[PDB]
Structure 1
Amino acid sequence: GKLRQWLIDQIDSGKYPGLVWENEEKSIFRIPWKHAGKQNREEDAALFKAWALFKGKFREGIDKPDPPTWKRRLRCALNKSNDFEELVERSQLDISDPYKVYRIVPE
Structure 2
Amino acid sequence: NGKLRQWLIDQIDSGKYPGLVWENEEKSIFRIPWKHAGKQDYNREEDAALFKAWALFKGKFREGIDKPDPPTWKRRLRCALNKSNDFEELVERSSDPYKVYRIVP
Question: Normalized against structure 1, the TM-score is what?
Answer: 0.92
Gaps of 5+ in 2: none
Please, which runs of 5 or more residues in structure 1 have no aligned partner? Answer: none
Counterpart of 2:59 in structure 1 is 56
| Cα shift readout 1:16-69 (whole Å, capped 9, x = no counterpart) | 001100001000000001111188212111000000000000011110011000
Distance 2:39 2:56 in 1: 23
Distance 1:18 1:38 in 2: 18
Counterpart Cα distance in 1 of 2:60 and 2:12: 21
Query: Hey, what's the Cα distance between the residues in 2 that align with 1:38 and 1:55?
Result: 28
Output the CA distance in 2 between the equivalents of 1:10 and 1:24.
Answer: 17
Identity over aligned residues, as a percent?
100
The residue number in structure 1 matching 2:32 is 31
Higher helix share: 2
Q: How large is the Cα RMSD of the aligned pairs?
A: 1.2
Q: TM-score, normalised by structure 2?
A: 0.93
Runs of 4+ in 1 over 3 A off after TM superposition: none
SS in 2 for 1:70: helix
- Using the alignment, how far apart are the partners of 1:83 and 1:9 within structure 2? 15
Deviations 1:68-94 (A, max 9, x none): 000010010001110000011110xxx
Cα separation, partners in 2 of 1:102 and 1:65, compared to 1, 3 Å: same
